[PDB]
Amino acid sequence: PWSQAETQSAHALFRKAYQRELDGLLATVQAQASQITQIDDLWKLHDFLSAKRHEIDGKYDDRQSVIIFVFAQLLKEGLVQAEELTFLAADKQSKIKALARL
Amino acid sequence: PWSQAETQSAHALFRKAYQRELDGLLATVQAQASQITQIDDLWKLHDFLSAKRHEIDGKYDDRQSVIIFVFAQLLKEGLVQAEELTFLAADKQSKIKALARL
């Protein structure tokens, strides 16, 4: 069961994390592109973008089946802070933190 | 049909052109990367890499039955100059310059 308030603030937090992931992605790309010397470095970068882009396209799934798992992943990846989950029910917060610890 | 020196000097220019395209590909990527401002710029870079890597994968066919068409494409693209084809038989040069206009 998800309240209106929970679903709405979760969406806002998804977008926030999404923007954080863009910033990180850009920084790494911008970095390992300036560190290029060999050409295979350029193909490694290409492979990285291809992969990270496909990951992101489907990472922010708001469906009831995985939405809890998604937050755990975001938390583990540092894309959201635990303090940003306090709009959720206590049981959801605990479950998320737990999954992310492992 | 094909001189032994023709074949050597052909494989050479062929490989010299490959290294020229890489030089230009690398220069463009490093430039695009360091000049990113929006996130869409990053997606453009990705699409550009995707396209060129494909184009390149199947452009450089070293096989004797095709080498003439490749040189034409390279000449048409500006990756080699007509002046660099003088080591070939007169009939081979003309053939190439003709195919380039297709």
CA dist., res. B86 & res. B67, Å (int): 15
| Torsion, Cα of A69, B38, A31, B50 (10° steps) | 80
Q: Give the nearest chain B residue to A33 (CA atoms).
A: B30
Domain extents in chain A: 1-102
Q: Which residue is it, tokens 């401002």?
A: B37
d(CA B60, CA B32): 25
Distance from CA of B90 to the nearest CA of A (A): 36
Closest CA to A52 of B101, B73, B42: B42
- The coordinates were experimentally obtained by X-ray
Resolution, Å (one decimal)? 2.5
Token pair 């390149």 is found at B56
Buried b (16+ CB within 10 A) or exposed e, B29-61: beebbeebeeeeebeebbeebeebeeeeeebee
Other CB atoms within 10 A of residue A43 CB: 12
Those residues whose C-beta lies under 8 Å from the C-beta of residue A85, and which sit 6 or more positions away, are A13, A71, A75, A92, A93, A96, A97
Cβ neighbours around B81 below 10 Å, total = 10
Q: What is the DSSP string of A9-27?
A: HHHHHHHHHHHHHHHHHHH
Confirm if A25 and B36 have CB atoms less than 8 A apart: no
Chain B contact set for A43 (CB, 8 A): 53
- Please report the DSSP string for B42-93 in residue order: HHHHHHHHHHHHHHHHTT----TTTHHHHHHHHHHHTSS-GGGGTTS-HHHH
Find the chain A residues whose C-beta atoms sit closer than 8 A to any C-beta of B. Answer: 22, 25-26, 29-30, 33-34, 36, 39, 42-43, 45-46, 49-50, 53
Taking Cα atoms as reference points, which of A36, A16, A83 lies closest to residue B31?
A36
Q: Residue A87 in contact with residue A9, Cβ under 8 Å?
A: yes
